[PDB]
Design a protein around this ligand. Structure first.
Ligand SMILES: OC[C@H]1O[C@@H](O[C@@H]2[C@@H](O)[C@H](O[C@@H]3[C@@H](O)[C@H](O[C@@H]4[C@@H](O)[C@H](O[C@@H]5[C@@H](O)[C@H](O[C@@H]6[C@@H](O)[C@H](O)O[C@H](CO)[C@H]6O)O[C@H](CO)[C@H]5O)O[C@H](CO)[C@H]4O)O[C@H](CO)[C@H]3O)O[C@H](CO)[C@H]2O)[C@H](O)[C@@H](O)[C@@H]1O
Ligand SMILES: OC[C@H]1O[C@@H](O[C@@H]2[C@@H](O)[C@H](O[C@@H]3[C@@H](O)[C@H](O[C@@H]4[C@@H](O)[C@H](O[C@@H]5[C@@H](O)[C@H](O)O[C@H](CO)[C@H]5O)O[C@H](CO)[C@H]4O)O[C@H](CO)[C@H]3O)O[C@H](CO)[C@H]2O)[C@H](O)[C@@H](O)[C@@H]1O
Length: 549
């Protein structure tokens, strides 16, 4: 039998305000992680409730930072949680895989800088000042995700291409570049697409905040927020948040050495899962087939499936909460990397859905990796709240065949909701949606850069594969604030027929679509189906469609 609870290990650094040389300790981690884009090192920085002076916590690759109070203002920095782009000469477009949660910031010059691109969530934060999302110098940046946060002053994206904010409060919002989408944000700018490109929804249809580690006195627990319907503003602004607390001893604390056999045994025996920061090779799928299981990763905990197996399979049960995990493909092709529900699953989970939150997938980049379909969502009512599903475009083990990955996300279940959907560079369809009444709020895609020629992406009678395809048989679907970009740098004579493909039906609707050619490297012929202007020139001007059909 598996023993629950226990020590969190050497990769969880726990601070309190009396800890000697905090600034030195977080600086040493940053120096190691700053340019460590593909290394296997992992860190979670955890701060006990209290007030911390004279701190500038710079956050590098694979570093999470968080407070351990029940509320964000319980753990306050007089100081900053900083991401900048110094290591990449002011270019922030590779600032991936890091996170900040459950802290209050009093930034030293009045504005906190969080200049990130994909897979860098900012959750349950209170910024007592402004929030600058751009690197110093206003260089390139491609984020981003803010949820359940309160920014007292102005959020300034400046150069940020696009952004998603949900269930939050902002004192102001400075500008929009290609696609700034908001749902349930108090203080959001009014709907105005295309100028500025603001897509604004009064509420989020359903959301359930990500579970997180905290301290109840001296005891570690995991808070599990209750879901909200038609959510707006923060969950924590008005007193004790709704939800339940799980004692650490009800978790199997996963550390280096654990096997999928032991992990699966823990779940069968009734334990939840806490993945401590590290890299976990498994030789069989991790299986979660118990209702309400929490599977929570710290410090960008990473699962690698060996032998071509699937990394994670969730059964046909209510309430599973998967959060804060990177799934990294192995060199042997996996048919699937993540499965939510069985094939053909038709039960409903409306009152208590399964969710994936801050679940990131990588294929290649840290060595060759391959997978046919990365995430398959079978279970009805599933919530996908911030995912980055990424076929690597740079790094080691990358190439049109070397890290081939045909399909990113396939949604087969009904009433599935995706909020903050980022999917890039797959050889065929990045996202396919076959289930009914699906909803996507915010989509960011970039197409494969390394397609060798036109013939390599021929899709029957269509040039290229849509970034986002709704199956012809679908009756109801709706999407808001969605963009697909191309950069066919291997062969810039390539044409991509469209970013989006869907049947023309009254129940299948899109709002605020765009496609963009990055510097004239390839062009789009249309935005969706054969509708919308082609892109033209080398000046990276979006082609837009406000309403479809
Ligand atoms: O790297 C691997 C990674 O790649 C990703 O794809 C890359 C993709 O991100 C990249 O796209 C480029 C794109 O970012 C860029 O967008 C620009 C945008 O930067 C620009 O911002 C302006 C700001 O410059 C300006 O700053 C103002 C400042 O000048 C002034 O001095 O002060 C002002 C404040 O006082 C300040 O505001 O501010 C304005 C708003 O006021 C911003 O609009 O805006 C332009 C549009 O105007 C926008 O185009 O454009 C480039 C082309 O020019 C894009 O190339 O492209 C790469 C390929 O070249 C991609 O690789 C993928 O997503 C990842 O998966 C990969 O791993
Ligand atoms: O003390 C509290 C503040 O802490 C800051 O953290 C510091 C962090 O930002 C800093 O990173 C350095 C990078 O900014 C630097 O990147 C270069 C840019 O500075 C530069 O910009 C210039 C611009 O300053 C000038 O006004 O205009 C120029 C023309 O437009 C423009 O070029 O662009 C460069 C590319 O051309 C770019 O490389 O790179 C440095 C070297 O790596 C980084 O050190 O690092 C500090 C030391 O560690 C951090 O303390 C927060 O960012 C603030 O929010 C806090 O207030």
């Amino acid at each position: 039998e598996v023993v629950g609870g226990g020590d969190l290990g050497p990769n969880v650094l726990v601070f309190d305000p009396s800890t000697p040389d905090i600034q030195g300790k977080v600086d040493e981690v940053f120096r190691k992680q700053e340019s460590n884009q593909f290394g296997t090192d992992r860190y979670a920085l955890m701060f006990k409730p209290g007030t911390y002076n004279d701190i500038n916590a710079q956050i590098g690759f694979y570093t999470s930072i968080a407070g351990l109070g029940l509320n964000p203002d319980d753990t306050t920095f007089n100081g900053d949680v900083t991401v900048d782009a110094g290591w990449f000469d002011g270019n922030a477009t590779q600032n991936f895989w890091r996170s900040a949660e459950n802290l209050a910031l009093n930034p030293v010059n009045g504005t906190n800088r969080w200049a990130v691109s994909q897979a860098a969530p900012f959750r349950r934060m209170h910024v007592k000042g402004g929030l600058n999302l751009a690197p110093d110098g206003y260089g390139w940046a491609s984020g981003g995700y803010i949820a359940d946060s309160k920014i007292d002053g102005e959020v300034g994206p400046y150069s940020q291409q696009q952004w998603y904010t949900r269930d939050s409060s902002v004192g102001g919002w400075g500008n929009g570049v290609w696609n700034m989408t908001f749902s349930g944000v108090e203080g959001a700018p009014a709907q105005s697409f295309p100028e500025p490109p603001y897509t604004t929804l009064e509420t989020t249809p359903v959301s359930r905040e990500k579970p997180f580690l905290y301290l109840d006195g001296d005891d570690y627990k995991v808070f599990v927020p209750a879901k909200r319907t038609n959510a707006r503003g923060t969950s924590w602004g008005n007193g004790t948040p709704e939800g339940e607390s799980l004692p650490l001893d009800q978790f199997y604390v996963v550390k280096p050495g654990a096997t999928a056999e032991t992990i699966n045994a823990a779940v069968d025996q009734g334990l939840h899962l806490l993945f401590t920061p590290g890299v976990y090779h498994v030789d069989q799928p991790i299986e979660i087939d118990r209702a309400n299981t929490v599977a929570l990763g710290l410090g960008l905990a990473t699962i690698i499936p060996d032998n071509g197996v699937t990394a994670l399979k969730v059964g046909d049960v209510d309430g599973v909460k998967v959060a804060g995990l990177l799934v990294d493909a192995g060199p042997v092709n996996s048919e699937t990397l993540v499965e939510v529900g069985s094939d053909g699953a038709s039960g409903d989970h409306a009152a208590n859905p399964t969710s994936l939150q801050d679940v990131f997938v990588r294929i290649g980049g840290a060595g060759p990796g391959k997978a046919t379909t990365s995430i398959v969502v079978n279970s009805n009512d599933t919530i996908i709240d911030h995912t980055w599903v990424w076929r690597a475009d740079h790094g080691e083990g990358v190439g049109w065949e070397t890290n081939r990955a045909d399909y990113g996300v396939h949604v087969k279940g009904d009433n599935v909701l995706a909020t903050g959907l980022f999917v890039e560079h797959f050889n065929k369809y990045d996202v396919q949606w076959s289930g009914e009444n699906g909803k996507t709020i915010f989509y960011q895609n970039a197409k494969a850069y390394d397609a060798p020629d036109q013939a390599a992406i021929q899709n029957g009678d269509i040039k290229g594969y849509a970034a986002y395809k709704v199956d012809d048989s679908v009756t109801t679907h709706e999407g808001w604030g969605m963009g697909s970009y191309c950069y066919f740098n291997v062969n810039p004579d390539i044409r991509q027929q469209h970013g989006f493909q869907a049947p023309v039906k009254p129940g299948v609707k899109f709002h605020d679509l765009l496609v963009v050619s990055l510097g004239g490297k390839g062009q789009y012929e249309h935005v969706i189906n054969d509708i919308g202007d082609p892109t033209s020139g080398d000046t990276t001007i979006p082609s837009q469609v406000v309403s479809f059909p």
